[model samples]
Target: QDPARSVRHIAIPAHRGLITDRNGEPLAVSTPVTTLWANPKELMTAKERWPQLAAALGQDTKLFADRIEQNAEREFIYLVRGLTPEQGEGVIALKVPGVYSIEEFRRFYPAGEVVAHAVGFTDVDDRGREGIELAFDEWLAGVPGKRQVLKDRRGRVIKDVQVTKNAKPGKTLALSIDLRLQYLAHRELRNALLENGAKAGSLVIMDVKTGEILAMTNQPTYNPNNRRNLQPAAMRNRAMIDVFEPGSTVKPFSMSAALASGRWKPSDIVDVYPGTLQIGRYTIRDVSRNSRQLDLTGILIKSSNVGISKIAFDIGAESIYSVMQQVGLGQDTGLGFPGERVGNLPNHRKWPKAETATLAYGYGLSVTAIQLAHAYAALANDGKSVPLSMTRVDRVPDGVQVISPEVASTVQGMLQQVVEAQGGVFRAQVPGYHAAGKSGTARKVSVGTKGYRENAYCSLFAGFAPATDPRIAMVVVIDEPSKAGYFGGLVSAPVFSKVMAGALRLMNVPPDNLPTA
Candidate 1:
C-alpha cells in the first residue's frame, strides 16, 4: 500500500445551537473559528520550514517541530485549536503544504458573568460543560461529520474518498429568563454584596402566575467568557443548590398552616410577654421589634418568633408538616438543574417538642432559596403551589390547591401588614408599591459539627411585590453580611426592594400602592 494513497477519517465540526432569553436576546451563540491540524508524517518533508509553522502558530520553532516529530507516526495533532478568521486565514495564506485549517465553533457568551450560571459554558471541543450548557448538553451539542479523504505524499488532499456522516447543528433553546430583570437583579445583588462585604449572596425572581424564573443570579459569579480566574465554587447556581435555615421567612407558612387547620383566624391573638420560651436545654426568644402580646396579623408584622411558635404549638407538627409538604418542602422543584439540593425538611414524627418549636421559627428545617420562593408563591398566587420552570411556557399550570382562596389572601394580607405596620419590614417597602415579605436572620451552622456559629449568620428576605394583586415573587439571601448589618430586614430586604422596584417597572406591572391624587 502506497503511504500517499492511505485514507484517513476526519471530523468536520458542527455549529452548536444558540441559547436565548425569553425575548430572544442572545445569551449563548456559536462563533465560527478555525482549528489548525496536521498529519505529522506528511509534515516531515517541511521540517526545515518548521520555524515558519512555529511563527504562524505563535509557537517556538524547535519545540514545535520536536512535538510534531515526536508524534510523526500519528495521523492527526492540533497545531492550534482556536483561531479567528484573520488569524487562521493568515496562517493558511503562509502556504505550508502539510498544515491545514478546519472549520469549528466556539461558544460565545454575550452577557458574560451576568448570566453565567444560567446559560453556562462549553468545552474546547464545543461540548457543553457547565450551567444550562451542561444541563442540555446532548441537545445543544450537534453531531459532527466524519469523512474519508485521500492524501498525497506531502499530506495535500488529492481527492475525497467519501463523506461517511453529515453534521447536525444544535437546536435553538429559549429560556424563561428576562434579560432586563436579570441584569437588574445582577447589578443590585452584586452591589449589595460588595457594599456589605458579604461572603456570598443569591437572588431569584419568579413570575407568580406561571412559575417562570424571570431572573436568577448569584454574587461571586464568574465570567464564562474568561475561565482563567474561574473558581469551581463560582460556577455554581447557588439559588438552586444552596440551602439554609430560613429563620422567620418560614413564619408565614406557620400562619398558613394555622389558617388551613381552621383552628385560627386572621384576627387571632397570642401572648409573648418577655418574648421568650424555654424548651429542653434551649431558650427561644424574640428580637421583639415590638410589644409582648400580638394579634395574628401583628405576630407576622412584628416578626415575633415566640408568637409564631405559639401558633405552631397550637396547630401542632402534623398541621404544620402537612402544609409544608404541600408547599413543596423536602423535595426538588423539578427544575432538573445540576447539583440542586432538596433541603432538609424532617418528618413530624421524629421531631421532639423542642425541635417542633424551633422549626416554627425556621431553625430545625433547611430550605433552598428557590424552595422558599416557591412556598411564598403559593401565598401570592391564590393558595396554589408553584410549578417551577426554566423554559418559557405558553400557559400557566394549574396550581396544586394547598389552602383555600381566602386563606392565601389572609396570609398575604398579614404579610402586607409586615410591610405596612409601623414595626415591620420597613426597609422592604417600595415607596409607591405594596410589598409583603418576611425577614430572616439565622445563625450559621459550624461546618463540621452539630453546633451553630456565634457570629456568622444567613440574612434572608422572601416576598412578592404589588401585594394587592401579586405578580412577581422574589427571594434574596446574604451569607455573613458583616459591615452594613446582618438582619434580614436590614440586609436582604433592601436588595429585594431595589430589585423588585425595577423589575415591576420593567414588567409594566401597575402600581397598586400609588398615592391617591
Candidate 2:
C-alpha cells in the first residue's frame, strides 16, 4: 500500500452515504453537527466555565462543573459528542474555556412508521442496526480509516500529527423498489386490517416483466423514532418469513405443471361430485355435497381441493418440485437481505402420494409470498421468468426454461375464469378491464403433526393486472383472520382490487375491458 495514497484518501472524514428510495426520496439520512470535549489538564484554571457548559447542555450545573473540574486530573474527557450546528454555535458563542464541539452525526426518517423496516435507520455513531441497514452493511457502509496522532506532556497537540490510512464510502446499492407502489400497498393493507378487525396482514406486489418487487408490507409496525419497544415478530418481514400452507393458491402451480406436461386442459372434465371424491383412505369433499360432474374451470371456480389434488397427483412430485425450483423455491433470492429463509420444498423421493396431493392444494410444503409471486411472474411474462426486481431493471432477466409456452398459456387462460367469470366466488369483476387470478385458503400448519385444525386459515390471491399485456403481478396473504369470511375471494380479493387500482393509475395504464355483464 502506498503511503501517499493512505493519507491522500486518509481515513475519510468518518462519514457514510445517505440512503434513499429509487426515486431519490430519503429513507435514511445523516445530520452533521459538533461535539463538545475538554482537554482536562488545561481546564483547571477556568473551572467556572463547567457550570455554564452543563446548564447549556440541560445537565445539573454543579455536576457538570465538578465532572469537568475533577476530570482535569485526567488526560482527556468528553462533555458531549453530538450537538446540532445551532447548539454547537451557541455553546461556542458563550466562549466556554475548555468546551469544544467535536463534530458527529445522527439519522432521521420522514415516512415514519410505514417504512420502518424496509429502509431502516441507524444510530448516532453511524452504525446500521435494522432492515436494509443491517443487511447491506457491507456495501452501504465502507471500512473506516485508521490514524495515530502525537500529544505533548500537557495533553496538548505539541507534536506534528501522523496519519496511517484513510477509508472510502462504498458504492451505491440501487434498489428495484418503487416508493409509490410501496406506500400504496402498505396503506391499503393497513386499511383492510383495521376494517376487518384483524391483528396483522402482509401484502407483496411484483413486476412480471423483470421479476422486480414493487412492494412488501406487513402491519403491527412501529414509529422509527421509538424503535426500542418493537417485538421480534412485529419486526419480521412476514411476507418473506412466515411460511404457511398455501391453500388453493397452490392450485395454479400444480395445475400449470400438469398442463405444461401435456397432462390436462382447461376444458377437461372429470367425475367431481358435490365436490366430493374418495380415493383410498381420503374422502375429498368441497363446501357443499351437491353431487355434480364438472369441467376443469368449474372445479377451480368452486375451489375444489379434491379436483386440484387429483390434478397434482397426476402432475407428480418430480414435475412439481422441478417447476418449483425453476420458480425459485427451496432457494434464496440473494437480495443481500437480512434473515431471508430459503423456505421448504421436497424432492421426488421424499414426496408420497398424500404429500403430493397435499402440495397440490397448498399444504405439506412451505413457501414465502415472494416465491409464489415469482412463479406467477414467470407465467405472466410469456413463459419467461424474470428476476424478481426491487429497483428499475436495466437488463432482462435470464430465465431457465422450465415450462413451455403452450403450458403457460393453457394455465393462464384457466386462471382467467377465477376473475372473469367463475362458479366459485374469486370472481372480482372490475369495470372495463379483464383480469386473471385464483383464490386460495390454506389451513395453518399446526403443532404435534395433528391432522385436524382448530379453525385457523390463511387466505391467498395472486394475479396480474391488464391480464392481456400484463405488467404487474401481485399476491396477498391474509393470515388467520377470525371472521365470517375465510374464503380468499372475500378477504383477499378486495385487497387485490385496492392495490391493483392504484398500480394501474400509477403506471398510467388505461382500462382494458369494455363494460359488460
Candidate 3:
C-alpha cells in the first residue's frame, strides 16, 4: 500500500436548524466555525515556531509552550475552539507543522437579550442548553456524517476513499414570536423596570385567535450571544419560570364565575359602604372609602375587594376554583420550555371563607405570567380555551368553550369599564385603541416570615386590545416596584399601553376606538 493511500475516517459536521419568527426573521442560526487542534507529540517538536502560534492565538508564549509540554504524552489536544474562518485561515497559512483545524457549527442569536429567554442558546458542542433550543433539541440537531479519505504525509486529504454516511441538515423551526413585536415589548418592559426601580419584570403578548405568543420578554435578561459570567437569575425566562400571586388582575375571571352562575348580573349592585368585609380572622378592605354602592362593573372599576369578596361568598368557592382551572391556572403551558413552573392553585377539601375571599381577588394561589396571559386570551377569545403555543400556527385548533360566550363577553365589557371608566385602570388606556385589563397590586410574601411585606408589591396588568373585538391578550408583571409607584395601574399598565399601542399598529389591526370627530 502506498504511503499516500493511508485511509483515515473523518466526520462531517451537520448544520443545526434555523429558528425564525412567524416571519422569516432569524432568531437563532448556526454558522460555520473552525476549531484548532494539534497532536501534542508532533507539535512539541517544533518548539522554535511556538511563539508564532501563540501570537496568532493571542496567548502567552510561555503558557502556550507549557500547555503543549504538559499534554505531551497525549496524542490529541485542543489548542482552541470557536475561531473565525478568517482567523483560522491566518493561522493555518503558517503551516508550521502539526497544527490542524476542523470545521464545526456554532449557534448565533440575532435578537440577543430581547429574545434570549425564548430562543435560548446552545452549548460549545452545539447542543441545546435552554429555551426552545432544549425543547426541540432533537428536531434541531441533525446527524453528523462519516467518510474514509486517503491522506498524504503532510496529513492533507489526497483522495476520497469511501463515502460512509450523509449528513442530514436540521429543519427550520418557525416560532409564533414576531421579532418586531418582541422589540417593542422588550423596550417598554425595560423602560418600566428602570422607571419603577423594580427588581424584575416579565411581559407577554399573545394573539387571541390563535393562542400564539407574539412577544414574551423578561427584564434582567442576558445576551445569549455573549454569556460571560452570566447569572442564573438573568437567564431565567421569568414569564414561564417564576410565579406570583396574580393579585386583583384576576378579578375579571372571578367575576366571570359570578356571571356564569346566573346568581349575579353586571348591573346588580353590591354595597361596598364602609369598604371592608370581615371573613373569619381576615378583613378584606377596599381602597375607596367614600363609595357606598358599586355594581359588579363598578366593583371591577374600583377594584373593590369588599365587593368581590361578597360575590365570592354568595357564589361559593367551587365556582371560582373551577373558573380559574378552566382558564389554565396552575398548569404547564405545554410549551415544554425548560424550567417552566406550574403555579400553585389550591383545591382544598376545606375552603375557608377567608381563603375564598382572597382567592377571588387573586391570592391564596400563584400563577406564572404566561398562564395569566393564557387565561386572558381565553376571555378575549370569547370563552374559548385554546392551548398556548410557542410555535407558529399554520392551522388554528378548535378551542374548548370554557365559559359561556355571553358571560365572557360580559366580563370583557366589565374589564373595558375598568380601563375606560374614571376609577378604573386609567393608565391602561391605549390611544386610538380600546384596551381592557385589570391592574393588580399584590403584597409580596416575606421570604422567611409567614406574613406579607407591607411595602413590597408585585405590580401587574393583564388584558386584551380592541375590547369590542379582541385581537391580542397581554400580561405585564413587575416584581417589587420600589420607585415612582407600586400600583399595577401606575407601574405595569403604562408598559401595557405603550407596547399594546405599537403592537396593534404593527399587526395593522384597525383601531376600534379612535375617538369621535
Candidate 4:
C-alpha cells in the first residue's frame, strides 16, 4: 500500500472481544500470534553478532550479511512475519543480533459476512472504518502500549524494558441490537434480495420512541478480513449511508405538518381532477391503479401525489420544513456512528414551487433510514420525538415536541387505513395486530445530482403497531429491487410485518387482535 517507506505501524494479532447479541451471540473476534522480523543488516553491522543472528532468523549467515549491508544503505528491513508470542519470547531469550519479535493483530469476523454492515470492520491499524466500527471505534479500539529495550556493553539486554504508557484494552460496547432480531432481519433481507433478484439491499429496524437500534442488516456484505475485491455498491450501508427521495411515505409528514398548524384538518377533501398536475414540465400523478379525488386520509391511504401536492400548496412550504426540522432532517441522529451521512434536505432558498409540491409526497429531499425511522418514531410514540440511539442508552434521551397527542393519534388512524384492502399497502399486515404505516417507491437518484435513477427505485415501508400503545416502529429499505415492481407495498411491507412480529414476541407484547381459542 506504500510506494515510500515512512510508516512503521502494523497489526499484530491480539485476542479481541466478541460482538454478540444482547444474549452474547458472537459477531466478530480475532486470534493472536507471535512473529519475528530480523534486520540482517544489524547482524552484519555487528561483526561478532552477525553469524549468530543468521542462525536465529533461520537464514544463511551469508544471506544475513548481505541483507544487513543492503538495508544499512536503506532505512530498515523485514526478516519474518507470523511469529507466536511464545516464539517471540524464545527469540528474546536467544539475544540474537538484530532479531526482534513483532506482535501482529489480525481482525476476524466470527459471523463471517453476515452482520458486516451492522457491526462493520476495522483496518490493519485496528481502527474502525465503517458500520459499528466507524460509529463506535473510539470505545471499541483501545490505546496501544509502548515499550523500549536497552542493552549492556556485551549487547545483551541488562534491563527488561523502559516503561511508557501501558496499553488499555478496548471497551465493551453493548449495542441496542438483539441478536435474534438482527439474525432474522439479515437473513430475511438477503433472501428477499435474492428472491426478487435485487442488485443489493438493506434492512433496518429500531424502537420508535427510545431510538434504540434493534437491528440493521445489509448486503452484499464485503468481507473485512480480506478486502481484496471491494465494490462501491456492495460497501454502501444503504440504511444510513444511501439517500433517496421518500416518495409517498412523505405524506404522513405532510399531514403532521398540516395537523400541527391550526389551519388544516384531516377530514378535508381535495379535488385532484385530471390525475396529473404540472409545475413547470414535471407532472405529479396518483401512485394508484388510477388517480381520483381523495381526502387527507385517502390521499395517504391511496397515495395520491396530486392530493399531497394540494396539501402542500395549502399548508405552504414553511410549515412542511418546520415539521421535518422538528423531526430531525439535515442533521445527525446523534447515534455517534462514524462515516455517518446526513442525507440531503434542500435549503429554503432553493425551495421552488415545484419543490414544495413534490416534497409534500416524498421527493426533492432525502433522509437516511435512521433519520426517517427516528422521525416516524415521533409520530408512533404519541407526538414525542426520541433521538435514534445505537447503543444501550442508560438515561432517557431528550426529544423535540413536534405534534399534539391528538394529532399524533389521528395520523396513526389515517396510516392504519393504508393497510386496509383498498389501501396501497394492505398486504403489510400482521395476523393478530393492527399496524399503521406508509409505503414508498422512489426512483433512484443520479449520483451527486439527486436526480431520479434510471429504471431503478428505492422501495421502503416504515410503520408501527398496535397503532395504540406503539411497541415497535421499524423501517425496511430495499435498494434497486428488480423488475417485479418495487413498490413499498410489494417489497418492503412483508419484512416489516415479520420483523415487527419477531420483535414484539421478543418484547412479550400482547397481541391486540389475537384470535380467541
lDDT of each: 0.85, 0.71, 0.89, 0.74
Model 3 segments more than 4 A misplaced: 1-10, 149-160, 514-517
Quote the lDDT for 199 in model 1. 93
Give a tens-digit lDDT track for model 3, residues 160-189.
877799989987999999999999999999
List clashing residue pairs in candidate 1. Answer: none
The candidate with the higher lDDT, 1 or 2, is: 1
- List candidate 4 segments past 4 Å from native: 1-20, 42-69, 72-98, 152-158, 289-291, 349-351, 446-454, 515-517
lDDT, candidate 2, 1-517, per-residue tens = 4122111121334556667666777766666768777777777767767677678888997777667666766756866777678878887888866555656666676777777767666765677787777777777677676556555555555443555667676445555667788899989888877766666778887878777777878876777766678577677777766766676776777777777777777878756665766667876667755646666787777777777767776767777767766777656753536666667876667666777777677666778887877777777777778766555577966865556877777777777777877365444554445677888876766667867576777778888777777788888888767788877888888888878888878878788775553
> Which residue runs does candidate 1 get wrong by more than 4 Å?
1-8, 151-157, 514-517
Summing lDDT over every window of 10 consecutive residues in candidate 2, give the lowest-scoring window: 2-11
Model 1 over residues 1-517: C-alpha lDDT tens digits?
6574667787877878899999999999999888888878778877777888898777888889779879987767888887887799888887776788787789889999999988888888788776788888888888998999887765667888888999888899888999999999999999989888899999999898998999999987998988998588898888888888888888888888898887999777788878888876888788864476689988887788888877887889777777777887667655767768888887756667777788777887888888888888887998987688888877878778877788889888888889878888899998679999888899999999789998899989999989999999999999999974789989999999999999999999888986675
For 99-118, candidate 4 gives per-residue lDDT tens digits of 66666665677665666777
At residue 76, what lDDT does model 3 achieve? 67
Q: Which stretches of candidate 2 lie over 4 Å from their true place?
A: 1-12, 37-48, 60-83, 92-98, 143-148, 159-173, 274-283, 334-336, 348-350, 424-427, 447-453, 515-517
For candidate 2, the per-residue lDDT at 96 reads: 68
TM-score of each: 0.95, 0.87, 0.94, 0.85
